[PDB]
């Protein structure tokens, strides 16, 4: 079974949960999964009522791993309060710069994800589930299709799964190059065969979603926790890591570190610990200048001792850690972030459309040294006016990292003016 070639992303874990198998860079098929006790949580769950599963996932304190951190149990409860049919969607668009964690669970432990989807679908009474995977992940698509066929041959999918009365089919859909299709509402739009335009909220997907029906969209990693919760029980799971943010957390570390890769760690872990204790310190032992929290935030070297949690003075985001050392031009890097937002705005909202283009256009001029004084004052203006009238989060944050970079590295910007 040949799949397309994949770089072997390094992976390390201290909890031995989501990365139990995925820390080795190869496809774990169903036989090997069954030997580690795979699909036994499914069997367990099918002898409990859907309600009981909702309650367990709620009591676990599992929060979403796609960014918002919304309680998964509450989201499921909201959806079941609305009459069916109901749909279950696995968000695998992972297109944010610096994020490569979801792909390793998909390419290495697909049956962990499939097992979670089946349990979760049964909890919300969904008989149709979708995995929406970005189109630049062709290998993960083909691996998922083969794994679904395996689970079906073993009686984990189809009609009347293991004599339970539950029917489930999992459809695998692909993207075609659009970061915005990771926003849950634009994903549903893409799933409907349309352009990936975010819908206005409310309504939220749990009331009106796919074909207007109650729809739960969950991230790959949120779903991958569900088998563990069923297997260990809610009380045991909730004691993992910090109380405020329980469970295994996945940190994608890239840039100027010696051991770039995915790390499974508790969230009480510090930013310095991630870089130095786990990721092998900086490359060449150069001093750290800044950490880019994906394309969302910019932390300086005077903020390395912060908990990697969702707290006041926390790191937040999706815990994405891109390291920049002393020799790296952060206005050259700021331009790179600008250019991301320029290529990814869907265009619906005027300030986002125009502001994302103009931020990148002008910063290029500033970088190349051909910006007039009016180009400078306009850059500043455009940067603080991408947000207005926007109906999704991309507009809200397109100027954010860059604004922090102006506030935290003024000396480096003055060099360009």
């Amino acid at each position: 079974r040949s799949y397309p070639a994949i770089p072997r992303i390094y992976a390390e874990t201290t909890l031995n949960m989501l990365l139990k198998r995925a820390k080795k860079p190869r496809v774990h098929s169903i036989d090997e999964y069954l030997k580690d006790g795979g699909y036994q949580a499914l069997e367990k769950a099918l002898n409990m009522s859907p309600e009981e599963i909702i309650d367990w996932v709620d009591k676990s304190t599992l929060r979403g791993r796609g960014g918002a951190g919304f309680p998964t149990g509450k989201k499921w409860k909201f959806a079941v309060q609305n009459p069916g049919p109901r749909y279950f969607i696995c968000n695998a668009d992972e297109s944010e710069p610096g994020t490569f964690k979801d792909r390793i669970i998909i390419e290495r432990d697909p049956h962990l994800l499939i097992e979670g989807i089946i349990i979760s679908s049964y909890a919300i009474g969904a008989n149709e589930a979708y995995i929406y995977i970005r189109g630049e992940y062709p290998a993960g698509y083909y691996i998922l299709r083969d794994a679904i066929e395996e689970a079906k041959k073993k009686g984990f999918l189809g009609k009347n799964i293991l004599g339970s009365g539950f029917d489930l089919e999992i459809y695998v859909a692909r993207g075609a190059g659009a970061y915005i299709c990771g926003e849950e509402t634009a994903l549903i739009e893409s799933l409907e065969g349309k352009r990936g335009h975010p819908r206005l909220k409310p309504p939220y997907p749990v009331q009106k979603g796919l074909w207007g029906k109650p729809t739960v969209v969950n991230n790959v990693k949120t779903i991958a926790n569900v088998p563990f919760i069923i297997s260990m029980g809610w009380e045991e799971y909730r004691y993992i890591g910090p109380s405020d943010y329980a469970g295994p957390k996945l940190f994608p570390v890239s840039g100027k570190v010696k051991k770039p890769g995915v790390y499974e760690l508790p969230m009480n872990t510090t930013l310095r610990e991630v870089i130095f204790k786990y990721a092998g310190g900086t490359l060449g032992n150069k001093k750290v200048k800044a950490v880019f929290s994906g394309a969302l935030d910019c932390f300086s070297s005077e903020e390395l001792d912060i908990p990697m949690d969702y707290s006041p003075l926390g790191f937040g985001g999706t815990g994405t850690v891109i390291v920049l050392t002393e020799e790296d031009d952060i206005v050259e890097a700021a331009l790179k972030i600008a250019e991301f937002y320029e290529h990814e705005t869907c265009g619906q909202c005027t300030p986002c459309r125009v502001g994302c283009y103009e931020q990148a256009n002008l910063l290029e001029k500033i970088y190349k040294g051909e910006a007039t004084e009016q180009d400078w004052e306009g850059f500043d203006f455009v940067n603080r006016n991408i947000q207005p009238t926007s109906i999704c989060g991309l507009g809200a944050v397109a100027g954010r990292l860059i604004r922090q970079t102006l506030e935290k590295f003024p000396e480096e910007w003055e060099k360009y003016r």
């Binding site: 970005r134 970061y179 790296d328 790179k336 991301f340």
Partner: protein, 155 residues
């Protein structure tokens, strides 16, 4: 304009796969580019029909998704990431090696219509930066000698 039957089969298969048939528009478009080495403009009228969809809907979809190309036919698309992480780790070294080897820059096809360099945003492999794909296969760039061996696999 009609598709070869070889190709119509695959498209019917995608269209039967999902519950409603219009959900298969991206898989049909992927399959057409795969087969022709681009999306021919003349291909979109018969696709729209199989999907029971108006032409201008399909036009807006092709235009929205960045993987699809209607300008240039190319056997092997070399997708080169230009986002923050790969920039830091040597996108410019990769593009230079590509220029030395293939004689082309981003957005150009080779004169034999074999390779097109396509600048793309983050490819979700940033730990192995700088990253590039050759159609579905994906790699880290280490050096020009290494790149040259990889490209020599694609005949």
């Amino acid at each position: 304009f009609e598709f070869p039957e070889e190709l119509k089969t695959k498209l019917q298969e995608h269209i039967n796969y999902f519950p409603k048939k219009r959900q298969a528009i991206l898989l049909c478009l992927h399959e057409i580019q795969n087969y022709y080495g681009y999306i021919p403009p003349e291909s979109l009228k018969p696709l729209a029909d199989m999907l029971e969809l108006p032409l201008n809907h399909v036009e807006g979809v092709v235009a929205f998704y960045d993987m699809f190309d209607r300008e240039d036919k190319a056997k092997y698309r070399i997708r080169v990431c230009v986002s923050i992480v790969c920039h830091l780790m040597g996108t410019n070294k990769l593009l230079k090696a590509l220029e030395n080897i293939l004689g082309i820059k981003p957005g150009e096809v080779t004169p034999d219509g074999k390779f097109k360099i396509v600048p793309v945003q983050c490819l979700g492999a940033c730990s192995e930066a700088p990253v590039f794909m050759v159609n579905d296969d994906e790699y880290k760039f280490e050096s020009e000698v290494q790149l040259n061996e990889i490209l020599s696999r694609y005949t």
